Write a protein that binds this ligand. Sequence first.
Ligand code: HEM
Ligand code: HEM
Ligand code: HEM
Ligand code: HEM
Lengths: 141, 141, 146, 146
Amino acid sequence: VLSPADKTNVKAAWGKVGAHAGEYGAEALERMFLSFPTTKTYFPHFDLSHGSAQVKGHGKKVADALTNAVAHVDDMPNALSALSDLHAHKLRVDPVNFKLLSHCLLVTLAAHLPAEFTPAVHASLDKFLASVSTVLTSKYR
Amino acid sequence: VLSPADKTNVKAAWGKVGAHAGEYGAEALERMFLSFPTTKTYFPHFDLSHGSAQVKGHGKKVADALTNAVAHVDDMPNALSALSDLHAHKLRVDPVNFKLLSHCLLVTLAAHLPAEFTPAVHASLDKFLASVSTVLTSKYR
Amino acid sequence: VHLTPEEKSAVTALWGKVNVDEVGGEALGRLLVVYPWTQRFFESFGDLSTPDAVMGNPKVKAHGKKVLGAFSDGLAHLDNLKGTFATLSELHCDKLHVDPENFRLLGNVLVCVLAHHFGKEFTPPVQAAYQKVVAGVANALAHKYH
Amino acid sequence: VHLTPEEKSAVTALWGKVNVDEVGGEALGRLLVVYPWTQRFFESFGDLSTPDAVMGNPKVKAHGKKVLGAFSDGLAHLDNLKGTFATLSELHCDKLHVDPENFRLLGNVLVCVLAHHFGKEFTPPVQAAYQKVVAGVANALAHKYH
Ligand code: HEM
Ligand code: HEM
Ligand code: HEM
Ligand code: HEM
């Protein structure tokens, strides 16, 4: 569970992301595709080329969803219900892939927020992405 | 999230285990030690030899806790609070290991409850062990 | 894989007792039931709405036999699972878009089916040898992913 | 590992810029803070109660430098990690009783640390090369477990 501390940490770091969320989302995807090629099996319909508009478009969507989870940090299961349903019933992404994206999201944030990416914030952000992942995978079976 | 059918399935299956739960506990451990030798890193103080009284005794302990969990299928978090504590603050077993013991327990049940180990019961028991795992690792951080 | 002659014998000998037809149909059906998200690749199979519907689906049963068939043939090349599954590895990647994690899930389901079938005979040491095999096969199938 | 020549150069170039003393303490400290369960091995290190207690602990810093020292050596024998890491693998298993999953967690933490330090210089493709490297090391370290 996220502690008050975690919550402050997440709102704070995500606060700094601001208007770059979209670009950071796209970057996390690219890092994931390059480091964990098996994740590509879920995007057979995408142009995964460098600077693909599809990836750009997709990065925004993911970033928008994370931003929404931050905005509703005290009611994530409900704020993300729809997305939980989509992933469980249509996309059917194997659970292990969530951990891969989370990791690439952490890398991206680290690379962009040197001052804010403290040990404590790193820990809170990891717990946060784990919670989002848990929600998105909660209706799988 | 265990469905009413699941809880039923689990209670039925475990119902059959009965007086052998301790033996099955012991056998699942033995299967884990052999199949996933990295799990032995948490038992340096035990005699891991076949039929060791330490393994036997420990198998009983694990079985009993599973029993207690089936009994409180509805209130797991609460029925296993002490165990969640022990594992989170004392034992500190890496969460990946829970999936290994869970698998070995399924295998053990399969091997001994042929008639009862139907596809639907297999599904329920898996979800059950997953839920037990989640509870036991919920206070890790 | 890194199977001991003894471990090789144990695998080899249990397998000789296996009805590939039945085990294959059961392994694949259990997979679709225990881990429902795996159904994403079998839409065209039909009704997978219930355990009963999956287990009974002939398209499922026949696919199971095809998969275990290939698996079966690989136990004859335990020293080169990699070269034995190269073309199959490319196909799964490039044509089927199957996440290799699925290979792992099946492996584990396979092990549960063997235990279910052989009870007593599927001892801890025999399971250990099979676990090494299923891991080896999954690794070989994932080898050409890019 | 399967490192293209251009992956090996990229790994090597960046590694040239790293202060192993510093990155070592940072990576180990962060591990103990992000995955507190990993503290199980360091009860003799003292106070690890808060992030500041961990990150600044002279023992964690010293240990971190030792670990990354051994790792840097690994980077010059990218051809034979298993060989390079054999006695260390034996020690971690037989004496220390360290679950090898710890090695993968540290690898991930290290990648974040490198991202933290190099910013934009830690490009998607450089990360991909380092991902291969930390996995190879974790694997090498786990190879002698039994
Ligand atoms: C916490 C992490 C994740 C978040 C916040 C997230 C969020 C989203 C969102 C907002 C969408 C678009 C739905 C729409 O059209 O409204 C989406 C679609 C999708 N996601 Fe997830 N997702 C996550 C993890 C993953 C992972 C790990 C994968 C696979 C590696 C994945 C695969 C997909 C795919 C294939 C689509 C459909 C894309 C398309 O065809 O346009 N997702 N996700
Ligand atoms: C199915 C999930 C599990 C359950 C229900 C469970 C239950 C228990 C119980 C009942 C005890 C004994 C507590 C006491 O002595 O009062 C225990 C202790 C212990 N467990 Fe867990 N356990 C589980 C998973 C694991 C796993 C996966 C590992 C490591 C691979 C593990 C490692 C240990 C160790 C090392 C001890 C202490 C043994 C001793 O020193 O006697 N447990 N567990
Ligand atoms: C033991 C591991 C596996 C082996 C040896 C294997 C082998 C095979 C073989 C021999 C084919 C025949 C297709 C052809 O030659 O054109 C096939 C097709 C296929 N496999 Fe795999 N398979 C394995 C695991 C899986 C898993 C776990 C899944 C998904 C859950 C999967 C999904 C598919 C699909 C979707 C096809 C195409 C069937 C069709 O054309 O209708 N496979 N596989
Ligand atoms: C990149 C991976 C790692 C490398 C290269 C590495 C290397 C080393 C070296 C060179 C030593 C000193 C050996 C000696 O005392 O003779 C050591 C000791 C030790 N390592 Fe590892 N290590 C790694 C990862 C880890 C991790 C992730 C953990 C635990 C989470 C760990 C736990 C320990 C412990 C507990 C000791 C003994 C400390 C003491 O009390 O002196 N190591 N390691």
